[PDB]
Each structure stands twice: as structure tokens, then as C-alpha cells.
Write a protein that holds these residues in place. Structure first.
Motif, PDB file in Angstrom:
ATOM      1  N   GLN A  85      23.793 -23.576 -55.477  1.00  0.00           N
ATOM      2  CA  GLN A  85      22.918 -24.217 -56.732  1.00  0.00           C
ATOM      3  C   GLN A  85      21.603 -23.504 -56.698  1.00  0.00           C
ATOM      4  OE1 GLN A  85      23.781 -26.891 -59.152  1.00  0.00           O
ATOM      5  NE2 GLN A  85      21.896 -25.802 -59.921  1.00  0.00           N
ATOM      6  N   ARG A  87      17.652 -23.957 -57.980  1.00  0.00           N
ATOM      7  CA  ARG A  87      16.913 -24.846 -58.509  1.00  0.00           C
ATOM      8  C   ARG A  87      15.231 -24.558 -58.481  1.00  0.00           C
ATOM      9  NH1 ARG A  87      17.646 -29.650 -54.258  1.00  0.00           N
ATOM     10  NH2 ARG A  87      16.203 -30.584 -55.778  1.00  0.00           N
ATOM     11  N   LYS A  94      14.817 -21.537 -55.475  1.00  0.00           N
ATOM     12  CA  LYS A  94      15.379 -21.990 -54.271  1.00  0.00           C
ATOM     13  C   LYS A  94      16.951 -22.142 -54.407  1.00  0.00           C
ATOM     14  CE  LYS A  94      11.579 -23.970 -51.562  1.00  0.00           C
ATOM     15  NZ  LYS A  94      10.717 -25.186 -51.467  1.00  0.00           N
ATOM     16  N   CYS A  95      17.695 -21.850 -53.253  1.00  0.00           N
ATOM     17  CA  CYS A  95      19.079 -21.779 -53.663  1.00  0.00           C
ATOM     18  C   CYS A  95      19.764 -22.656 -52.284  1.00  0.00           C
ATOM     19  CB  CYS A  95      19.483 -20.204 -53.213  1.00  0.00           C
ATOM     20  SG  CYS A  95      21.413 -20.205 -53.894  1.00  0.00           S
ATOM     21  N   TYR A  96      20.664 -23.564 -52.659  1.00  0.00           N
ATOM     22  CA  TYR A  96      21.198 -24.289 -51.858  1.00  0.00           C
ATOM     23  C   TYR A  96      22.884 -24.226 -51.840  1.00  0.00           C
ATOM     24  CZ  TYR A  96      16.790 -26.452 -52.466  1.00  0.00           C
ATOM     25  OH  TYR A  96      15.417 -26.738 -52.105  1.00  0.00           O
ATOM     26  N   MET A  98      26.116 -26.791 -51.344  1.00  0.00           N
ATOM     27  CA  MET A  98      26.496 -28.487 -50.765  1.00  0.00           C
ATOM     28  C   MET A  98      28.072 -28.420 -50.875  1.00  0.00           C
ATOM     29  SD  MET A  98      26.282 -31.768 -53.500  1.00  0.00           S
ATOM     30  CE  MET A  98      27.471 -32.813 -53.560  1.00  0.00           C
ATOM     31  N   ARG A 117      25.175 -33.200 -49.744  1.00  0.00           N
ATOM     32  CA  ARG A 117      23.682 -32.905 -49.566  1.00  0.00           C
ATOM     33  C   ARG A 117      23.509 -31.510 -49.798  1.00  0.00           C
ATOM     34  NH1 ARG A 117      19.336 -32.179 -45.916  1.00  0.00           N
ATOM     35  NH2 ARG A 117      20.568 -31.800 -44.056  1.00  0.00           N
ATOM     36  N   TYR A 118      22.290 -31.096 -50.317  1.00  0.00           N
ATOM     37  CA  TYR A 118      22.100 -29.823 -50.634  1.00  0.00           C
ATOM     38  C   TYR A 118      21.278 -29.247 -49.297  1.00  0.00           C
ATOM     39  CZ  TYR A 118      22.946 -29.726 -55.663  1.00  0.00           C
ATOM     40  OH  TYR A 118      23.496 -29.694 -56.765  1.00  0.00           O
ATOM     41  N   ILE A 119      21.887 -28.048 -48.887  1.00  0.00           N
ATOM     42  CA  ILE A 119      21.335 -27.547 -47.596  1.00  0.00           C
ATOM     43  C   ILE A 119      20.632 -25.991 -48.154  1.00  0.00           C
ATOM     44  CG2 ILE A 119      21.700 -26.561 -45.355  1.00  0.00           C
ATOM     45  CD1 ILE A 119      22.530 -29.503 -45.712  1.00  0.00           C
ATOM     46  N   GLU A 120      19.558 -25.818 -47.717  1.00  0.00           N
ATOM     47  CA  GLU A 120      18.631 -24.756 -48.442  1.00  0.00           C
ATOM     48  C   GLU A 120      19.291 -23.446 -47.623  1.00  0.00           C
ATOM     49  OE1 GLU A 120      14.308 -24.765 -48.184  1.00  0.00           O
ATOM     50  OE2 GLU A 120      14.236 -22.901 -49.149  1.00  0.00           O
ATOM     51  N   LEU A 121      19.468 -22.347 -48.441  1.00  0.00           N
ATOM     52  CA  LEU A 121      19.996 -21.217 -48.252  1.00  0.00           C
ATOM     53  C   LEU A 121      18.640 -19.972 -47.935  1.00  0.00           C
ATOM     54  CD1 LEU A 121      23.125 -20.633 -50.276  1.00  0.00           C
ATOM     55  CD2 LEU A 121      23.088 -20.883 -48.007  1.00  0.00           C
TER      56      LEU A 121
END
Length: 145
Positions: A85, A87, A94-96, A98, A117-121
């Protein structure tokens, strides 16, 4: 179980708004390697610029209906496993990932991520589609350009 956040945006649209010509833009892709044979090159490459979100899931494909944007031939993966994802988080792209509460879990650099939960990549980050390394035949690595 996924619906996009209110600040979802694609890299292309983001970069369009800033008025950058194609050569001056950050390109995103998912580079997939087969674990046994990485000394042969990328099994697949996916462009991650055209969309704000991408579904990753199982695609064995010898009768099963295709649902996932990015299909992985891994019996132990779920059909709707995880989502990538993009955003606009208060002015920065930023890319995440989930994990969509998949059966076996998702790892980022061999560490299990919590679900829902979204985890930042970060560029270089290696996604694998199970808690346990032995189950994995493929590695999905997130890259900038």
C-alpha cells in the motif's frame, strides 16, 4: 479484509502532482526471486507505479480463480495474503505491507510481522509469505528504482 486509507495514492499520481518528467521520478518495483536459483536472476518483476495498492497471494496454476495482482506459486500461502500500500503520509510517499491475517504469516527480512497493521517498507526489504523459512520457495523484494 482490506480497504485503502484516505491518503492512498499511486506513485505515478504523486509524481504527476510534483510535475516530474519520467526520468526524474523514483520508480518502484517488486523483484521476485526463486530461493534455490537466485544465481540465475529475477523470476519476475512487477511495476509498482501505476497503482496505490497491490494484492499479493497464492497462484499455483497447474482451475482456481485469479484474485491477486501478484501471484506466488506457493502452496503454503493464502490467496489474499498481504497488501502493498502506497500512502501520501503528510507529504511524503511511503510504502507499507499489511498481512491480511493469513494462515501461515508474512516475514519482512525473516522477521514475522504482526497482522492487521501497516509495516513501513524500505528499498531492499525482503518479503516472504510464511513465518517459517522452510515453507518459502520465493522471495519478494521491494526496490526503489
Amino acid at each position: 479484509k482490506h480497504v485503502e486509507p484516505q491518503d492512498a495514492i499511486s506513485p505515478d499520481n504523486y509524481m504527476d502532482m510534483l510535475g516530474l518528467e519520467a526520468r526524474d521520478r523514483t520508480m518502484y518495483e517488486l523483484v521476485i526471486y526463486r530461493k534455490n536459483d537466485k544465481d540465475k536472476g529475477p523470476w519476475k518483476r512487477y511495476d509498482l507505479n501505476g497503482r496505490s495498492c497491490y494484492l499479493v497471494g497464492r497462484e499455483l496454476g497447474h482451475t482456481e480463480i485469479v484474485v491477486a495482482d501478484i501471484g506466488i506459486p506457493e502452496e503454503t500461502s493464502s490467496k489474499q495474503h498481504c497488501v502493498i500500500q502506497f500512502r501520501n503520509v503528510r507529504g511524503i510517499l511511503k510504502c507499507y505491507v499489511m498481512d491480511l491475517d493469513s494462515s501461515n504469516g508474512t516475514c519482512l527480512n525473516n522477521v514475522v510481522i504482526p497482522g492487521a497493521r501497516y509495516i513501513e517498507l524500505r528499498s531492499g526489504d525482503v518479503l516472504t509469505l510464511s513465518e517459517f523459512e522452510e515453507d518459502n520457495d520465493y522471495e519478494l523484494i521491494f526496490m526503489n528504482v
